[model samples]
Target: EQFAVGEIITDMAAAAWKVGLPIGQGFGCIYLADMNSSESVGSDAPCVVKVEPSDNGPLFTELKFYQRAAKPEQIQKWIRTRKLKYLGVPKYWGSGLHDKNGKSYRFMIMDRFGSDLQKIYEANAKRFSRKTVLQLSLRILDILEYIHEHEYVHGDIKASNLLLNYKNPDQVYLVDYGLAYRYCPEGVHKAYAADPKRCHDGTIEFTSIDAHNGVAPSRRGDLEILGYCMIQWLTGHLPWEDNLKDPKYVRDSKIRYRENIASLMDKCFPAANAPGEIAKYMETVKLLDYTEKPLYENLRDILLQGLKAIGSKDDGKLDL
Candidate 1:
């Protein structure tokens, strides 16, 4: 009943033209919507619409971000002022509720993106070179720093959430704000507390230990998830991947991540005789407090150092 495409799109504004089948396996069904002939006020590029039962909170959470926190106008200004060549934020068009078959559902529209990093990883034989990994890591870190500066934590930071730009392969974006949360307000920070009921809120394999304990997400948790992503990008798999179905098993393994750091590093970069910077980055993240802002430059320097260690230089591009 939730995925009846015909019923779901009924009464949606005439401007939204279905261009692709629904994809994504969470709270909603995602469809590619082409606005070429539609009079959508925003950009004319093709966009995507995610439809879900109104009761599901992710769509609402995502709307709050685009409409308020990560407003496109403000983000465009931030990018221009910072001279950042690229930051992969989805462009928001609009959202509304649609009544179909006596039931109401929520739907949101935004710019569509190309393939995700997971597909990119698989196409490249499961591993990215050290240089490529570092470059990608730095780009994602830049995005993370921006989001963190705005007081949000992308609770889920994995390959599938990172997408390539449809118009430019060099440009990649972070999508799916369903798990995003505001950890701090202008001058206030959330006090740390663990709630057993909220434990295991994110994808089991790479979710932060704090999440496993049902604690609110913070800067450190974001980086920890990124660390897991970095490792997987460089090595193609994480030790916890095998235990994903069992939340407790995955949580226990992640808890012991530090204890098994040495082995994990070897497993991730076995082909490279030289060391990589991800381990260093992970070490720094391990030392962070829940509410503390990370030393972004310092962390980035560590990744750059790894590039130098491998006899490479930062080309200032992600296509390396």
Candidate 2:
């Protein structure tokens, strides 16, 4: 909100964009940037600019990831090579330093987006139908795989962080890399470290146990977080949701539940009708050793089977 409504800002290429109203806010204040290119504050906002204080570390880190791997050409090529309908990763446009009132700021431009998944979740009575969860989880696995291959783990994966394409609701995007981790850099993975001081680092209910144990997030952690999201969307409840204020309790509950998958299913689903694919997915994630690379295809197949069981298929329709 700090940038004046009609103030013009230019990217590294000197291409101009304007902003004031933040379309959304997660890490930095994100404003709708209308790029009529060199000038004109027109009605169309084809992109967005995320601005933060110059000293803010998360935006800097987020910018680096986008520069290094999320460039438009790189992502487009990957989408082609991988034969994906569309990749959820946001495309990097440009970034530059800004100055206003003698204070320095940093801003990056990216494609504009629509609503976050959390809003739709609430509108749907806090529950996603079986087909919807499977559909979402499958796309998410594709996203995680791409980011993981590029050597980053989206340390935060939740409903609020997932957004939809403003024009096409069928296309969803993962946003806010403020907590993204370079778990693997230059083809080498980071070591396991459970520093007690950094414990319970992510959104408590959906965070991986590795996070609860204070380890830097890895591929497995990202995948684990998705599993939690799937369960929450399907049932609209996680056993630890009510105890979120107590980090220790949330951590312990996840640990206990991870160890006893059957009980966890019974507790969440509470009858003979538990989603078997979710149980199968958790079992797979449970076996991923710390620092181990996950088989993303296997995870997707598990969710695919879930869709099949319900007399449906992954037509990519999120039947919310």
Candidate 3:
């Protein structure tokens, strides 16, 4: 039925036309029709139109981001790999433009995803289970590895940025690589403008500590943001649940993230495994909170937890 005013079909078509990219058919707060641009990029490209795994037609892509390309130095180099690492968003097809002009360039064409997981969480408020949260959390970590391993940081990590496959809700495709770039060991990239007053500019609730302080980010910060995302997903709110109601309390307040993992883990799992599987995971996360551990142990802990929980169910994959 008519949800609002204008003709729904024509309005939908008009939305697709504005995006000017291939999209697939799906319905949600943040989705639309595919632009049929798959011929231009890779099979897995998030912008690939008419290429959804499911037969869902009329694909739609949010994020009408056809930003002008920065100078040659602005774009980070992505090293391609085939082994099972956590896949973030969709694989980039390639970058090109109509002419070699300085500006007027196109970003990537991506595969059409079902809808943002955040919308699902909103629709089914408390349906998320601990097991489910943990499982998806593990996958997001894999996506983190995909970016970190290639020596890049997904500066912007948030629930709204995640897109799930229509065929499998479990398969999450990380979107919004616009703020993404290669991590420079030396200094912050010019494109990445970290906000001091909690202004990292990605999504609000999912902002990382490093982003809040204007510090150059490493894998650790990304993990912290991942932890925040997990916490937000599980509790149906951010860690600062109480403070959120107070206008005086800003979300960037460190007090929000200060409670150890015990605070979050205890809410879900009992203490018995909390110290082992859950707390240990949070503790390991602490090591990864603001400072990234250069050793294998810091990064490997995430994989180890997955292996322990599911048993041989996962093949113990840890390339990062």
Best by TM-score: 2
Residue pairs whose backbone atoms clash in candidate 1: 88-173
lDDT for model 2, please: 0.86
Best by lDDT: 2
- Each model's RMSD to truth, in Å? 4.1, 2.0, 9.9
lDDT of 3 by residue, 114-215 (tens): 677767777776345445556566667666765565455676777667777755665776765435544543444333445243223345456555555565
Where model 2 places Cα greater than 4 Å from the true spot, the runs are 25-27, 37-44, 194-200
Per-model TM-score versus the true fold? 0.84, 0.94, 0.59
Q: List per-prediction Cα lDDT, in the order shown.
A: 0.75, 0.86, 0.47
Among all windows of ten consecutive residues in candidate 3, which has the lowest summed lDDT?
1-10
Query: Residue 242 CA error for candidate 3 (Å)?
Result: 4.9
> Which parts of model 1 are misplaced by more than 4 Å?
1-27, 34-45, 195-200, 271-274
Q: Using lDDT, rank the candidates from best to worst.
A: 2, 1, 3
Give a tens-digit lDDT track for model 2, residues 8-73: 788888887777466654545878787644554544577888888889888888899999889999
